[PDB]
Amino acid sequence: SINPIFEPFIEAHRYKVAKGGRGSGKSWAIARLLVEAARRQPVRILCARELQNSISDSVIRLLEDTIEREGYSAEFEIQRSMIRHLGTNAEFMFYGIKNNPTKIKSLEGIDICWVEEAEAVTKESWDILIPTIRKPFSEIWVSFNPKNILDDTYQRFVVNPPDDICLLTVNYTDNPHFPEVLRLEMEECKRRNPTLYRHIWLGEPVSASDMAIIKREWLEAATDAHKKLGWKAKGAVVSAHDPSDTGPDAKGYASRHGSVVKRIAEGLLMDINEGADWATSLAIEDGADHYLWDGDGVGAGLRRQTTEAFSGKKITATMFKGSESPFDEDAPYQAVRTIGDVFRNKRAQFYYALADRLYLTYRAVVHGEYADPDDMLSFDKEAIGEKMLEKLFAELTQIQRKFNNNGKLELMTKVEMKQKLGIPSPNLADALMMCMHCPALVREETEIYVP
């Protein structure tokens, strides 16, 4: 008998999509149905995936194992990159979309395309693949484990689905032959990191909390926004350092030139002094006029080393304590209510400064609403590097408001984030937040003055 949950995939539908976490057996279910179809119809079946650096990355072994398991071996011809039924002449072929877009576009007579590990498939790859499956009554079958809700595959098939889709959600709980080997992994994870367990094993996509303060779409708009809207970085250079703690979590550094972010860096396997040396050296390299570091924890004693590093250079050095009452707390709140009435503390104050800059930039880029570039924020992608930029964005989107019994704005602490969300401390995000603050007044011709 075939897995009953997959019965709807036997009926005709243009799109057949199965999503869920690990151990659901969905790929085995799909392999079985395609083998049974191949035994009965002269179908050409394209097995596709985002990247196929070798044939061993494809589902070919899975199909062979399926054929052997059911006892169908004598019905088939097996080659390194082809399976063919000797009765119907049905054929399976295997290509990576990134690897052979030309070959894929040139394929004719395809009846079924199975895209496996489809969470890896990019918008560009879908746009290439889908128009090629153009035979009347041809079908696209898709199996994936959700990553982020905003990823193209999830958007394309779950959020804004096409006409004539059969969507199944299947997890290990729907697998009557869930392997003990996987049950062992699942329970281990469920206990150790409940949030991660829901993502990996219950197939829950990563999505922004309703309490999140910075949206991914704003960060995308803000990427190279100075190029998009055509302005240049003007202002002081501000750098900041998050020394993390005694644990493994990477240290953070961020630097900006006025409204344009120019560097985001991580500091691995450093003690507190190595970290401060690294960060102050980066600030010197970046031509910083102002440097801040988090002194609320392990960084509380770094003033001496920091000021010594800057000896002979006019660089201001400010210990940032996110737990303190907001800067200028008795001043009117702008954009009888004071700054202190609005924000619980400096961490909230400056995260909202960041969020505000980002939202304004988004409104400018996406909705064409004018804003002063000084009040915006752009990420210089070429300067920062795509890799570090993505790391930063993945942290920023998890920063969350928490309920406050005095109606003030307050955020979850990094310790709370680690404990509830099961993620490392967001030290890149915090480093960028700290460089929102410029408390030290200076001019080339004057003293540094801290009011």
Side-chain angles (χ1 to χ4, degrees), residues 226 231-233 255-262 377-380:
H226 70 290
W231 46 272
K232 292 295 252 281
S255 188
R256 66 183 172 100
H257 177 187
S259 297
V260 181
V261 182
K262 297 285 185 176
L377 193 73
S378 182
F379 301 100
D380 189 332

Side-chain angles (χ1 to χ4, degrees), residues 149-193:
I149 198 165
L150 295 179
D151 294 331
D152 192 75
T153 298
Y154 203 95
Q155 289 292 297
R156 180 179 295 273
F157 296 115
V158 188
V159 178
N160 310 307
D163 175 53
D164 195 21
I165 174 179
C166 180
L167 179 72
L168 304 175
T169 300
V170 184
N171 295 281
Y172 70 90
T173 52
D174 307 288
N175 183 2
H177 301 133
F178 181 48
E180 175 69 4
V181 181
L182 292 187
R183 189 191 68 81
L184 261 34
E185 298 178 1
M186 181 272 301
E187 290 292 347
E188 184 280 309
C189 185
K190 174 212 290 287
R191 176 184 164 79
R192 184 172 46 83
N193 192 334

Side-chain angles (χ1 to χ4, degrees), residues 426-448:
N427 304 331
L428 297 178
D430 271 39
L432 181 66
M433 172 272 296
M434 287 184 293
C435 82
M436 299 296 99
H437 180 35
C438 214
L441 299 175
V442 66
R443 286 176 64 204
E444 179 172 325
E445 310 94 321
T446 70
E447 72 286 349
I448 299 175

Side-chain angles (χ1 to χ4, degrees), residues 408-424:
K408 296 188 187 173
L409 300 178
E410 188 182 353
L411 305 178
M412 285 187 50
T413 61
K414 295 194 304 195
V415 166
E416 288 175 326
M417 290 180 75
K418 177 129 67 160
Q419 293 189 354
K420 173 180 179 180
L421 308 174
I423 65 170

Side-chain angles (χ1 to χ4, degrees), residues 157-399:
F157 296 115
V158 188
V159 178
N160 310 307
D163 175 53
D164 195 21
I165 174 179
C166 180
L167 179 72
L168 304 175
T169 300
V170 184
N171 295 281
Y172 70 90
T173 52
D174 307 288
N175 183 2
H177 301 133
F178 181 48
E180 175 69 4
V181 181
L182 292 187
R183 189 191 68 81
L184 261 34
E185 298 178 1
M186 181 272 301
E187 290 292 347
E188 184 280 309
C189 185
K190 174 212 290 287
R191 176 184 164 79
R192 184 172 46 83
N193 192 334
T195 298
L196 181 62
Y197 152 82
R198 300 194 297 274
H199 176 56
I200 298 302
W201 295 98
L202 291 179
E204 292 184 9
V206 181
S207 74
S209 169
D210 53 7
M211 303 292 277
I213 62 158
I214 290 166
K215 297 187 180 173
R216 181 85 201 197
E217 18 283 297
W218 307 349
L219 298 175
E220 300 292 349
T223 301
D224 289 328
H226 70 290
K227 294 180 174 183
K228 299 171 179 170
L229 300 172
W231 46 272
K232 292 295 252 281
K234 289 292 185 184
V237 176
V238 181
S239 293
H241 170 49
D242 186 325
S244 183
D245 59 17
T246 58
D249 295 347
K251 301 174 181 282
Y253 174 92
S255 188
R256 66 183 172 100
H257 177 187
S259 297
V260 181
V261 182
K262 297 285 185 176
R263 192 191 302 267
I264 299 294
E266 59 187 11
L268 287 174
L269 202 57
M270 293 170 184
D271 71 14
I272 195 68
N273 304 117
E274 296 172 319
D277 184 21
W278 163 75
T280 56
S281 281
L282 285 172
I284 291 165
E285 176 178 348
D286 286 333
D289 297 296
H290 302 287
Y291 170 93
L292 303 92
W293 80 98
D294 173 11
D296 254 345
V298 295
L302 292 172
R303 193 187 311 282
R304 192 175 65 167
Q305 184 183 344
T306 301
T307 54
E308 279 177 7
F310 297 149
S311 288
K313 306 189 205 312
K314 194 178 272 183
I315 306 180
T316 74
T318 297
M319 183 185 296
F320 183 99
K321 293 184 82 163
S323 60
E324 281 176 0
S325 289
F327 181 78
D328 207 17
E329 70 166 330
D330 289 335
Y333 175 70
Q334 178 50 44
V336 89
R337 185 178 290 123
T338 63
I339 290 183
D341 291 302
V342 171
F343 302 111
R344 185 171 188 161
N345 54 32
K346 283 185 177 70
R347 186 136 182 292
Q349 178 176 25
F350 294 105
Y351 259 118
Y352 277 97
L354 174 61
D356 284 353
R357 285 189 184 251
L358 285 171
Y359 185 61
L360 187 70
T361 306
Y362 169 79
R363 297 299 292 192
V365 172
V366 168
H367 294 117
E369 295 172 0
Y370 178 74
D372 192 327
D374 282 14
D375 297 319
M376 289 194 274
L377 193 73
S378 182
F379 301 100
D380 189 332
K381 184 171 75 174
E382 178 168 12
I384 294 170
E386 188 165 18
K387 172 68 168 151
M388 292 310 299
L389 189 58
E390 184 50 48
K391 286 196 175 179
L392 171 71
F393 286 1
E395 295 188 358
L396 286 174
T397 53
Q398 304 182 85
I399 300 297

